[PDB]
Amino acid sequence: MLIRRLKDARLRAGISQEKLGVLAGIDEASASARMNQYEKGKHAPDFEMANRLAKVLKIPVSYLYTPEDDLAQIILTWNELNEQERKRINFYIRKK
Amino acid sequence: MLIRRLKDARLRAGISQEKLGVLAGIDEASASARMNQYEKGKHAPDFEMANRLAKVLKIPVSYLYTPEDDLAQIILTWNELNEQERKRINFYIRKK
């Protein structure tokens, strides 16, 4: 998982490390330390934990694993497109 | 990592479990077993190994972590768009 993706998504949500960890199911006594460890690259979450974090942060989980900034932005944006916008992109992509 | 993403990307490349493992730097004696284990969900690769697999398979690594089929397809397709198509999508996404 890319640490800067996790940090960015948390900053965008506007929530603290402790609050993110807590909503992700971590004992609040350890919540902030655990999140800080992930964000500093000391430990990597497993895919199951990353999915929990992504759910709390309201992002597609694969955003956290996307090294390419342009693709990351597309992922983050797709996430919030209305159904007509998604259709247009889906159609544009069809057969390509 | 999603096992079906790994398997699909390997089938699309048209290469065997052994050849994928080998090009990914695994001792050929263990290559196919190791790949089969990943593809059957017995072990999960770490992000560094997933990046190696994705490089061999010529896909954005985050494809392997994308649960949503529509987003997966967008990722796989973006991967192969010409520079003008990418520009159009980038522009469409701007400010959204």
Author numbering:
A (entry chain A), B (entry chain B): 1 to 96
Text of the article:
The protein crystallised in two space groups: a monoclinic form (P21) and a cubic form (F4132). The calculated Matthews coefficients were 2.38 Å3 Da− 1 (one monomer in the asymmetric unit) and 2.01 Å3 Da− 1 (two monomers in the asymmetric unit) for the cubic and monoclinic structures, respectively. Thus, there is a crystallographic dyad between the two subunits in the cubic form, whereas the subunits are related by a noncrystallographic dyad in the monoclinic form. Structures from the two alternative space groups are very similar, and a least-squares fit of the monomer from the cubic unit cell data to either of the monomers from the monoclinic unit cell data gave an RMSD of 0.94 Å. A comparison of the dimers (formed by a crystallographic dyad in the cubic form and by a noncrystallographic dyad in the monoclinic form) resulted in an RMSD of 1.31 Å, reflecting a slight hinge movement at the dyad interface. A similar analysis of the monoclinic form of C.Csp231I reveals the same major features at the dimer interface, with an equivalent pair of interchain H-bonds. The buried surface area is reduced by ca 200 Å due to a small outward rotation of the final C-terminal helices relative to each other (residues 88–96), which may in part be due to the observed differences in crystal packing contacts in this region. The analysis of B-factors in the cubic crystal form of C.Csp231I reveals that the extended C-terminal region of the protein, comprising helices 6 and 7, is significantly more mobile than the rest of the structure. This is not so apparent in the monoclinic form, where crystal packing forces stabilise this region and the B-factors are more evenly distributed throughout the entire structure.
Controller proteins play a key role in the temporal regulation of gene expression in bacterial restriction–modification (R–M) systems and are important mediators of horizontal gene transfer. They form the basis of a highly cooperative, concentration-dependent genetic switch involved in both activation and repression of R–M genes. Here we present biophysical, biochemical, and high-resolution structural analysis of a novel class of controller proteins, exemplified by C.Csp231I. In contrast to all previously solved C-protein structures, each protein subunit has two extra helices at the C-terminus, which play a large part in maintaining the dimer interface.
